[PDB]
Predict the structure of Piezo-type mechanosensitive ion channel component 1.
Amino acid sequence: SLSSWMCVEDIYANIFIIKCSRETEKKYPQPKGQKKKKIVKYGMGGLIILFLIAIIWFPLLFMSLVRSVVGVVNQPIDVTVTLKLGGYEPLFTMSAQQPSIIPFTAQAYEELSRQFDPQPLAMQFISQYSPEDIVTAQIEGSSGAL
Amino acid sequence: FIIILNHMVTASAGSLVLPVLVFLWAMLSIPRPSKRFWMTAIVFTEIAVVVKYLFTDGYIKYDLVQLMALFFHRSQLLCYRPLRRFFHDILHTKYRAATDVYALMFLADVVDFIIIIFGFWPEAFLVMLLIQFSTMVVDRALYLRKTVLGKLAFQVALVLAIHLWMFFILPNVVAQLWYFVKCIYFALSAYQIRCGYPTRILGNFLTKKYNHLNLFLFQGFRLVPFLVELRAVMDWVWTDTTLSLSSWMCVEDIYANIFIIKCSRETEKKYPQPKGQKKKKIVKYGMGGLII
Amino acid sequence: DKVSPPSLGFLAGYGIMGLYVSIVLVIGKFVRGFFSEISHSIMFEELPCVDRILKLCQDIFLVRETRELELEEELYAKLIFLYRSPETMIKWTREKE
Amino acid sequence: DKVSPPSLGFLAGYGIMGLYVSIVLVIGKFVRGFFSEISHSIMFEELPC
Amino acid sequence: VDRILKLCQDIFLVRETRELELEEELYAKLIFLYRSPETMIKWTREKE
Amino acid sequence: DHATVIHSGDYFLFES
Ligand SMILES: CCCCCCCC/C=C\CCCCCCCC(=O)O[C@@H](COC(=O)CCCCCCCCCCCCCCCCC)COP(=O)(O)OCCN
Ligand SMILES: CCCCCCCC/C=C\CCCCCCCC(=O)O[C@@H](COC(=O)CCCCCCCCCCCCCCCCC)COP(=O)(O)OCCN
């Protein structure tokens, strides 16, 4: 049948592998009572040990490597400001666009640091941002609309 | 204890000298730490007091305890080229009652491993984990090959390295512990370099008594993923054998299973059960219940 | 505030931490396979001289070629009764020196 | 440019290619189970009466 | 399982004192107990 | 030879 066919084929595969090994040990005999050479041991064993470390630590390492990335400075393109009295049409509307939007120079950042040096909570906040993350929108004081 | 506790609190670079010297001059001296160790410690602690005085609020409180503890010792110890020579003694002495403290040197290393992992709060953690693992492997090698000179060198290296890396490069309750537990490792290691390895070092540790605790610890150690396998290969590489790896690992399996049967045969001789007695309902409902 | 666009952000979350642990467990049991019950197959893998069995296995094949299928059945019976009696394999597989 | 909204886009990426390979390997070892050591249980499965 | 525990512990003693010729001869006994199901029913019987 | 010592056990060793 098939069960029996496959049991004859398994016996043959394993009897072959034993036969091959019996031959090699007749062509290259080893003396009685001779320690296995250190090189063989350190080679085979070494690889196995390494594989185990690389199945535990390495996965974690690679995931943590992925986590070493950056963030992007998304400065505003437009800073739209409106002053509205109650229900009525806005009194003032201005759109500070690219030129009016000026990123902080290192000097403007040092000036901010100086101005807020007396407030430790303000310095703790300022120190979270780069000079590129802080922008001055120079909003023109005349309404850009009638 | 106090010299090491000072370095955990102050964490400077002045309070690093004495902990290094404890682990590499005091604990590795065969007869007893000499006068010169104790006098060095007294003089150094006095200096640091003066120096810090001549320069915050907290500065000289722990150093007062230190100095007074070192002068207490002196009172008890009074009521009752050189480098080569020092090393020679350690390597070849005659006052070496031999002991085996590998079991425990290892438990300290396990506990550390756990601290690093559990309290991971990252490249730092990653590198440190590998370091701890690699020290454990080297330790096994020097145990199985029985080298005291190798253990001396490993101690010297590790003491200096950890005391520098963790106190300059790397910089915290987690790291404060890691340090205490690694200090216990350096102490136990020094006992072994001073006492010497025994004659019969091979064997297991939990397979000496055939009780019930032993069975449950053996079986538990087998469950940790990878431990059983790494032990086997490591012991093969370093012990001198005529067998291969296939055959080494077949002798180690026969032994594990013959142990487990032996433990169970013992329990059933100490606590016999009558012929023809039904298994009690509680046992059944407990085991079965959980499975369901 | 700085915005953040990752490329390999599929490996994120505590579900990914749990996944890792589970992988280790599975691989662990696979490795145990090679180191656990290797004493149960010593009877069928430590045979001293495997030559007389190689002749039976190669004679089943010759018979299949020349289509004399009655002898395929009788030679299958010998192979199955060697592997069903552990002590007749220690007679057939001994080093005849 | 044309925009693109897939519905079954969970099967995308080279991670999905690697996943496929791994599945094959696992199933492969499972099938081997049936064809490998079937000679070790002949004593307990070929009983005449 | 007591007589097998003695063979397994004697392989270990020989490895300690480095008399590696007897490690080979004692491995041969352990391998021929596990290769003959009926010599294990003689070695592992309760000697009462 | 090593492999003729490993593979040479008989039923006489497991005797008395
Ligand atoms: C014209 C009719 C002539 C005779 C027809 C019936 C004779 C052959 C009967 C089997 C063929 C028809 C059934 C098809 C299903 C095949 C499996 C089966 O036999 O059906 C049964 C197996 O039980 C039997 O063996 C009863 C005999 C029926 C099949 C006999 C074929 C050879 C008999 C010895 C081998 C045992 C089964 C091996 C077959 C598959 C091996 C991978 C289902 O276990 P399974 O494998 O699913 O478990 C795998 C679960 N993971
Ligand atoms: C200076 C030269 C001195 C002699 C060199 C050759 C003697 C040793 C030969 C093996 C070492 C060199 C080959 C490295 C590959 C190691 C595996 C191997 O032997 O290569 C073969 C195994 O076949 C052989 O055993 C042929 C003998 C070569 C190795 C002999 C070592 C001991 C022999 C008895 C054990 C059998 C294999 C055990 C080795 C690994 C056990 C986990 C590959 O099956 P594997 O395991 O990959 O299947 C796992 C698949 N999942």
